[PDB]
Amino acid sequence: DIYPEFGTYPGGGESPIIPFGSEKNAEREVIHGRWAMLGVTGAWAAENGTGIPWFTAGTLCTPDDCTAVADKFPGAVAPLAPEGSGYPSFWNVLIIEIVLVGAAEAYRTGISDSPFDDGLTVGDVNPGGRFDPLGLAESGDLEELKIKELKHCRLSMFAWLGCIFQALATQEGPIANWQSHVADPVHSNVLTNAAKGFGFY
Amino acid sequence: DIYPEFGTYPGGGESPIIPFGSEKNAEREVIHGRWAMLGVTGAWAAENGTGIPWFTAGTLCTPDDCTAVADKFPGAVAPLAPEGSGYPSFWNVLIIEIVLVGAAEAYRTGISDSPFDDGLTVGDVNPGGRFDPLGLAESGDLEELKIKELKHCRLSMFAWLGCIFQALATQEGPIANWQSHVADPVHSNVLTNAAKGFGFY
Amino acid sequence: RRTKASVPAKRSAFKANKFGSLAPPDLYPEFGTYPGGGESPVIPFGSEKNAEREIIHGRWAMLGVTGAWAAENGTGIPWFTAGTLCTPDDCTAVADKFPGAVAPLAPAGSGYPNFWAVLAIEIFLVGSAECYRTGLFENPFPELTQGDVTPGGRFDPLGFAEAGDLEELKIKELKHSRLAMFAWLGCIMQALATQEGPIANWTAHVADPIHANVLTNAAKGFKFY
Ligand code: CLA
Ligand code: CLA
Ligand code: CLA
Ligand SMILES: CC1=C[C@H](O)CC(C)(C)[C@H]1/C=C/C(C)=C/C=C/C(C)=C/C=C/C=C(C)/C=C/C=C(\C)CCC1=C(C)C[C@H](O)CC1(C)C
């Protein structure tokens, strides 16, 4: 069996708890997983590198101050910024964020015409035409690789939901919570935190 | 076109996010919308004219005392109560509103027969048999006015949802949150209040 | 050893005699309808499995509501804090929690329910039963069907199912199930809002009915505003 766990891939199955409904729901699922995966690994890396929890990283960069981000990146040869000048600013990045992500979005979904105009079809999660220069889509069992990615997608989203609920309850951070649990698993758990209260009880 | 924004009205096509399901859902959407129109408009007007938050307005009338509600109307020529505080009462307002709203609801749905004795049909929204003393429904484009009503329904409900979550976070009031936003658009928003922790973090 | 294969001819210690239906011919005049007898009033029927899921959550929530009720009546400890008693450390306390208990789970001294001991027994018993109920493990009782919430063989030793009308009893259980689940939801929301046990909230609400309500505690912000 390809998918021995509880649920099954959309292509074949029944979706036991929630009905399958639209196929756009499956499109969203994959995209949510492909995103949350990047989010979870980014929160992991930010906690490991800087010790700053992900959920307050936005406090760092603000309209008045967005210079602190420059010195955070570990092992960089020169800063992010022009040193004292600190050209990077919240708005400086924001205009860049909105234009670049909006272009990437729209050329993905087909709100605007595809610039690549290379036969790629919008509304498919797996293009496999240009976004795989390495050819791992072409080679190997492509369907099995869709399965693995899906599994990683669902795991990462569930871990993301865990991360947000741990940020709400513990207020410490994902990796800080991981270190607390590993240092002592018996007396550092969700139920131990509930016994102590989540800061509200 | 008719519905250029995201999504569509019940007859326009398939729902993007939640499948349409039962036909009664459209009726619930309209009724909830109209109640949210009333609710948002009341929350605005009471906060603008008086200044009390709508959410704490519940505590203001209580069976210990419901005279603070009296005379708290802008430009009120006629007092709500006599000079006597005893005549106005929380249960006096409650009993009449229970019987009036229960009658209105039962007549609208058909638990009890229509006293109006009109062509207005139960299990139906905006019959228009008598609810529109002015014939601009039929004189104007009835379908255009219906889609306009529905767009205002969805706007008012989404705004009411935002109002309740702002009350839970900001605890200052919807209109008062508006005032804070315009007073300082960049230092007063969600992200700033999240940096403050919504009063809990 | 030879094969005897005699006739047991044993009767149930108690076997309820036919009592039929004790309900009116109308069976769900309440809001909504039982599954397999009409259209779901509001929420869409997710799957055929959802009926059995409703039954299981219902029976579990019945048992949970009665447990919180009896625990608070017998000890005064709220259900949501009763977990803090039996822990890997100092699970001795959890023992003497039953009013009138001739003996303690923890005899005086070291003798005691260990959390891990209790836990290990809990996994080995409850998980086994949970699996045997569902398609996991196998079927130790072939005469019964795994995946059926109403087996009604060895699981009704008193035979109420066959003694009365089966389907009215089924809907009666379903109504009790939905009532107890909604009551359980009320209990968790009350625990969140007031930080006091269900029977404590009940007592506060019956001593002075006019105050000690949702809206009274809301006037204080549910201790958060
Ligand atoms: C938002 C992301 C997302 C999306 C769009 C989907 C969509 C889908 N999944 Mg995927 N999945 C997700 C999350 C998601 N899932 C996560 C996190 C897990 C890990 C538990 C899985 C695990 C999973 C399995 C194992 C299976 C699916 C299946 C399916 C399909 C059936 C369900 C459906 O159509 O309704 C989609 C409806 C929703 C996504 C709404 C969910 C609503 C609940 C209430 C969410 C609860 C968490 C929520 C975010 C909490 C709020 C937090 C907030 C307070 C901050 C569909 C294609 C099944 C399938 O393909 O069948 C063939 C299948 O077998 N998925
Ligand atoms: C209770 C109010 C309500 C109701 C009954 C409906 C019902 C409907 N809408 Mg409307 N709609 C609403 C709210 C509502 N909508 C709001 C606020 C918006 C603006 C965001 C819209 C925007 C909208 C669009 C754009 C479209 C619809 C469509 C539809 C139909 C699709 C079926 C559906 O939604 O399932 C019934 C509803 C549900 C199953 C909703 C469950 C709740 C969801 C998952 C999350 C909501 C969060 C919740 C408020 C959190 C509360 C927490 C708080 C208590 C603390 C149906 C007629 C579609 C349509 O007509 O297609 C033909 C369509 O295209 N609606
Ligand atoms: C988890 C328990 C549970 C389950 C599995 C079901 C399942 C079912 N019910 Mg039952 N029911 C329940 C609870 C439940 N119900 C409760 C508590 C009540 C009393 C209010 C009822 C009352 C009821 C009636 C009156 C009827 C049904 C019907 C049905 C069927 C159709 C609905 C469906 O498939 O979608 C199930 C979908 C859901 C359960 C999703 C709803 C989720 C909301 C948001 C509630 C979440 C609860 C809570 C706020 C979570 C807190 C989280 C915590 C972290 C704070 C199905 C067998 C109908 C039927 O049989 O049709 C023929 C019918 O007529 N049920
Ligand atoms: C379905 C549908 C159809 C209609 O169309 C419309 C509609 C709106 C009615 C809609 C309805 C939806 C809804 C409202 C769903 C809600 C479901 C819910 C709330 C289920 C709860 C299920 C709850 C369980 C199993 C709990 C078991 C509890 C146990 C073991 C406790 C054990 C225990 C005890 C004794 C005391 C110790 O201290 C410790 C612990 C705590 C361990």
Numbering used by the authors:
A (entry chain R), B (entry chain P): 33 to 233
C (entry chain Q): 29 to 253
What did the original publication write about this model?
Here, we report the structure and function of the O. tauri photosystem I (PSI) supercomplex in low light conditions, where it expands its photon-absorbing capacity by assembling with the light-harvesting complexes I (LHCI) and a prasinophyte-specific light-harvesting complex (Lhcp). Interestingly, nine Lhcp subunits, including one Lhcp1 monomer with a phosphorylated amino-terminal threonine and eight Lhcp2 monomers, oligomerize into three trimers and associate with PSI on the third side between Lhca6 and PsaK. While Lhcp, Lhcb (apoproteins of LHCII), and Lhca (apoproteins of LHCI) all belong to the LHC superfamily, Lhcp proteins form a separate clade with characteristics of an ancestral state of LHC proteins instead of belonging to the clades of Lhcb or Lhca. In terms of pigment composition, OtLhcp1 and OtLhcp2 each contain 14 Chl molecules (8 Chl a, 5 Chl b, and 1 Mdp) and 7 carotenoid molecules (4 Dlt, 2 Prx, and 1 Nex).
